[PDB]
């Protein structure tokens, strides 16, 4: 366990993690101990820089909107949906394959259409 | 430095001074107590890690500083099927 007790946890997208990792990196610029990021943390940053398909804020907004779309879409599943950006029904299938509920073709298209926004265009 | 010699420091109220004379300058032994269990946990060289009996590696155990005599006493009571559950209290 980290510390004495865990009071709150949240599932986070790669995009949001990219911002947090960049902060931790920029914080060093720390002078007295400098505090360099350990190797795997630097690796995680690089991977995050490359796989963050959305901007930090639009990723949050998409995550919240997907959560309010259905009850069977929790924070973890929504975060995964934002990380993957499913294009069609096949992509939705593999995401929910080992999950609690499997979306019908109809509600799958609802998710896709919501995710049809926010797509980076460039 | 026996009974009355303890009672004098007690009378003045010098606790630190007691421990100072009777323990800290002899055999101070450190054992790891589980928080929700009360049973002394377990370190491990070769692998370098803790793990209490009832709770498995996962549970954060806390260090406790004591005279070896009491550790031996806990052990003896425990061999007699008595459980000396240690109620920790925070730093």
């Amino acid at each position: 366990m980290i510390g004495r007790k865990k009071l709150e946890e949240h599932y986070i997208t790669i995009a949001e993690a990219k911002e947090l990792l960049e902060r931790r990196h920029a914080e060093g610029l720390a002078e007295n101990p400098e505090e360099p990021m350990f190797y795997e943390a630097r690796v995680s940053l690089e991977h995050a820089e490359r796989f963050a398909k959305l901007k930090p804020e639009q990723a949050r907004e998409l995550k919240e909107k997907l959560m309010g779309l259905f009850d069977w879409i929790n924070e973890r599943i929504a975060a995964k949906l934002v990380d993957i950006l499913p294009e069609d029904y096949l992509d939705i299938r593999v995401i929910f394959a080992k999950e609690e509920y499997m979306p019908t073709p109809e509600e799958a298209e609802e998710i896709i259409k919501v995710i049809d926004e926010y797509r980076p265009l460039e | 430095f026996g009974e009355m010699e303890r009672d004098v420091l007690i009378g003045h109220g010098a606790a630190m001074l007691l421990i100072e004379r009777l323990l800290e300058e002899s055999d101070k032994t450190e054992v790891w107590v589980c928080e929700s269990c009360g049973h002394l946990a377990l370190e491990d060289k070769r692998r370098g890690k803790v793990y209490c009996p009832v709770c498995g590696e996962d549970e954060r155990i806390s260090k406790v500083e004591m005279s070896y005599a009491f550790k031996l006493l806990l052990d003896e009571l425990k061999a007699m099927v008595i459980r000396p559950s240690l109620r920790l209290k925070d730093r």
Binding site: - | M66, I82, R83
Partner: protein
């Protein structure tokens, strides 16, 4: 105290309840510490000999004081 006058030792005050440890080292007491401990129900403390036998600061004297200090700066 207790509602009746009782001797200051063994069959009275020293003889009564404190914590098991204040009778655990009660001189090899078979029919006591063996009897007291053979009844495993509860256990408190905040005594005196219990803490010195265990390696703890006695709760008398300074032990009943707690420090505090804000660290800026």
């Amino acid at each position: 105290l207790d509602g009746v006058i009782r001797p200051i030792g063994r069959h009275g005050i020293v003889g009564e309840k404190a914590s098991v440890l204040a009778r655990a080292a009660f001189e090899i007491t078979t029919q006591h510490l063996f009897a007291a401990a053979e009844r495993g129900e509860v256990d408190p403390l905040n005594g005196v000999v219990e803490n010195v036998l265990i390696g703890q600061p006695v709760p008398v004297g300074t032990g009943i004081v707690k420090l505090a200090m804000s660290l800026p700066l």
